Write a protein that binds this DNA or RNA. Sequence first.
RNA 1: CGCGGGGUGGAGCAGCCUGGUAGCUCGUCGGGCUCAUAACCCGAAGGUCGUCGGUUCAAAUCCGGCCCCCGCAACCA
RNA 2: AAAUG
RNA 3: CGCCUCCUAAAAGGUAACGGAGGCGCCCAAAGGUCCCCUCAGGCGGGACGGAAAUCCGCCGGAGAGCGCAAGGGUAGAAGG
Lengths: 30, 48, 100, 181, 176, 119, 77, 224
Amino acid sequence: VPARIICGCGNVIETYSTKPEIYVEVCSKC
Amino acid sequence: VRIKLLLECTECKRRNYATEKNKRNTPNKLELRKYCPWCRKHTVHREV
Amino acid sequence: RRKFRVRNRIKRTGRLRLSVFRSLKHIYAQIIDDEKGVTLVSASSLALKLKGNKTEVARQVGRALAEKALALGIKQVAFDRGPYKYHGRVKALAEGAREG
Amino acid sequence: PLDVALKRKYYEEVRPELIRRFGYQNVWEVPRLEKVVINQGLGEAKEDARILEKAAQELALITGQKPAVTRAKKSISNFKLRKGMPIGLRVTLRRDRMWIFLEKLLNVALPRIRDFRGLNPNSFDGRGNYNLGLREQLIFPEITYDMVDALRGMDIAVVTTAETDEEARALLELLGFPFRK
Amino acid sequence: MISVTDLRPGTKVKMDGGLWECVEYQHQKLGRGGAKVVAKFKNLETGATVERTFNSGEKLEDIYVETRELQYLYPEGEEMVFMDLETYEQFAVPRSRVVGAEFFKEGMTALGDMYEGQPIKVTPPTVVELKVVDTPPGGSKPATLETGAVVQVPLFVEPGEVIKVDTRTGEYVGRA
Amino acid sequence: ARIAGVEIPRNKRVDVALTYIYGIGKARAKEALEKTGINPATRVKDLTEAEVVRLREYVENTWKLEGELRAEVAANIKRLMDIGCYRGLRHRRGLPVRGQRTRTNARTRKGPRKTVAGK
Amino acid sequence: STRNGRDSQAKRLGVKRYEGQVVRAGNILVRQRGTRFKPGKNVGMGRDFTLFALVDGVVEFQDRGRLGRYVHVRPLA
Amino acid sequence: KRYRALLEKVDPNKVYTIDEAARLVKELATAKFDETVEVHAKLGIDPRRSDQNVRGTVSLPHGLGKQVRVLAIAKGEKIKEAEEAGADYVGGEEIIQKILDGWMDFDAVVATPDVMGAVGSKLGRILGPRGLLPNPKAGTVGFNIGEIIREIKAGRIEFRNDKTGAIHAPVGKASFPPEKLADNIRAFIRALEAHKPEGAKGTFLRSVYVTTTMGPSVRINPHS
RNA sequence: CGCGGGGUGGAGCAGCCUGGUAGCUCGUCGGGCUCAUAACCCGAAGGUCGUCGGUUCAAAUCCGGCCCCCGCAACCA
RNA sequence: AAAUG
RNA sequence: CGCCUCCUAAAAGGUAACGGAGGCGCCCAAAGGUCCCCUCAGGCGGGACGGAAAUCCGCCGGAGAGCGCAAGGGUAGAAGG
Ligand SMILES: [Mg+2]
Ligand SMILES: [Mg+2]
Ligand SMILES: [Mg+2]
Ligand SMILES: [Mg+2]
Ligand SMILES: [Mg+2]
Ligand SMILES: [Mg+2]
Ligand SMILES: [Mg+2]
Ligand SMILES: [Mg+2]
Ligand SMILES: [Mg+2]
Ligand SMILES: [Mg+2]
Ligand SMILES: [Mg+2]
Ligand SMILES: [Mg+2]
Ligand SMILES: [Mg+2]
């Protein structure tokens, strides 16, 4: 199933895997 | 051997036998298979 | 140093092989007689044109090899095909008293 | 799913470069991705009833492919466990599973790795393929800190139809693989 | 039925209806007579010994008294039960054939002389750990160990304190 | 509750929870909360993604710590691998380097014991 | 006083019907341990690797390079 | 009273022929629940003769069910075989903690050799005098745990001689189809007869009966 | 020249058939009791298991060759 | 109960 | 002191010695039928805990692996998994 990457560093990522409820506390922002 | 042991097979209520060799300890604790009797043909077969 | 062994053949003891070939687009099949190294009967897939299913296409080339065969004395053979996997593509064709 | 953010990027942003870069002739001939493997040794099929399936439903929880439980081939006195069954866990990623994975890895995963100052540039070498290891497994999104009794590192091996490292290097590089450079 | 010329210390055999084990063996062939085997033995259960002599012929009758390692489980009647931590069989050994059955412990690993699946000698180790559950906090005082037996110990050793005791002398050989 | 370098504290007030970091002492933790106006007493188990995020904001860039500081210090100590700075020639031989009594004590910089005989 | 002096009763192995000899169905043609020789035309082999005629005929020894050695039996034509 | 009109259903002098006590064993038992048909027999041996004690189980053609909670204490995927076998409770040296401290809601207890060690080491005295501990003779130890667990449900029950020199064992339920229990009995005898300690002087089965869980016990001819 | 057994912490002995475990007593060093020394009490260190090969997933252990060891024989002339 | 300098 | 393997044994078989050197008195209810699949040991890279071979990836590798046990013949176009 598709998904959403809700970091904190803004930047959301729409892709796929399991459970589109992802709080990636730190995407590619370092 | 001892852990080995000899044994035959009885047609289920009756005669005839096969006489194979079980193997105690390892796969043991009783054992039966399908085999053909001098009389009529094919059935189970228990030890004893 | 060899991908697939095959040799389901090699296990050919009973004369007259029904040698098959699984081409990406077609299917050929010959009735070979080793101990002579001669092919007694053919009948290919698209090398005869024929339909467009693939498997239903095989069925055809099957009946085509059988009929042709029979009228030559053949009537008893042994199937084959290396990676035959004997599936889908199977040509359980009528005639040819080779059973199976 | 037949297509992803990275998949596209490869086709319409990497494909071009490499060609322009090394100057390939035939379409195919240019670096593509074959498969990326991710296994775990665990070595923990010891006493106490080594279930360690959690690590299997997880390995695959972040992959989407139940892993294949490999076993010991020989048998070693030195470190207990021997002859057979015991340890081993590993899944092979291809096609779309291959893409929808590398994405996260490259976008969300590698990012949070204790220090991580890029990916050691030597792990190629003659390999038209690449290899790298991870200590944790929580580096991924599909899994949180709470749920995971114990830690679990793993090896990630990406195979490439590339013959050279430059070919391999560039590719994984145009894709998004950070590099200890 | 093994002869004698083929004995060796350690060989166990059945003599006079009893169980022994050659511990001394010396071929003797002096003068031109026939050879002779002069050995010394030890009963497997009692300690009793007995040096003897045999001609070259004379056969003896080897026995199969292998020594597996058993394990205590629980008391019952005037017996105590063990287990071969190997095939986990159950052996109900009569208090007599369990050397130092006391000073033992319901859960300790010891040794037994399996003779046809029935121990005739069950020895623990020379010294085992045991929790004294007795003794007056009062020097060389008596202390009832968890196994009911009593032992002489120093002062500092007080109730609850687990100690060591040579299972041959039942003497306090230090603390845990 | 992953902060600078995913180091995760929890279920207790942030004040001390921050301390649970290599580079965050009770001080840098009490000067870190007022600079983002959050409630010290609050349990880490509740705080706007913003409170946490802008928190992981400061922390990480406010000062270099664990991982990078941790590793870094070792290097600090390395440099004393010159030619013979007496402050290093004590670091090479696991011994205190701030002039502490050595005859006795000084145990903390020398593992347990070695004893040996007497005269 | 030695530690040896043992051996095993010889077994008499080898080809027991050479090329061009007439046999009858049944004749064991070869006795051998491994498969020094392999079955051929009208030549089944046994449990112990013993090649034996399958039909009345002659014996032929086909050497097949790295493919091994064969013993066939071309029946009487 | 109440057993009086219940006890008349037994010829104190007579000798039955299994079957005889089968139609009967049902008229003997009558309660507000299904009574299990018990069986007793004074075997000719001496307890004190360590060798002659009788520890053996038997898989029955009829009777016996999952009326038992079996615990499989093992390591590895043995658990998978066990759980799939019908191992109400599963788990190695972590479940020992359940039992060790209070827990006790099962009947049988199978296990695997590999984890068997710790078991009897730290469970000996507890389930030891309880006969629950895993023993080879009483086949509740091993690796083929599958059949094992799967079988304590079909019809395999133990029966170890007591100290008085007698052995008893439930051969089935009271509302059992006539020729089933009667047949289920010979199965029990033929196996216990089949276990005669080599040096047991005299006649073996000396007193063998057919009782009901609650009441009457008709002695029979164990060769009927 | 054969006959059997033996080489394991500093000493003297277990452990070896039933391969995965170094057990004991004394000694040693540390610390207490004494003015001190013993004793005694507390605690600790120490074994290429004679060597060189092989067998095993692994060997003190099973297998072989050597090296030292201890004891027994060498008779009819 | 309990040696010696 | 019977049985197996190799040498002696002189290119068929057979062949002695208080000649050289080793094994056996068992074992597997799968280590047996059959059908379908798979190919090794090692070696150089490459890789989190990881020896010097635990698991993974890439080549290179016709057999040096394996085939319960001695040795021999045999064998990956399987006798191996
Ligand atoms: Mg001879
Ligand atoms: Mg000879
Ligand atoms: Mg000979
Ligand atoms: Mg020979
Ligand atoms: Mg001292
Ligand atoms: Mg003979
Ligand atoms: Mg020769
Ligand atoms: Mg010859
Ligand atoms: Mg390899
Ligand atoms: Mg490597
Ligand atoms: Mg390793
Ligand atoms: Mg490695
Ligand atoms: Mg290797």
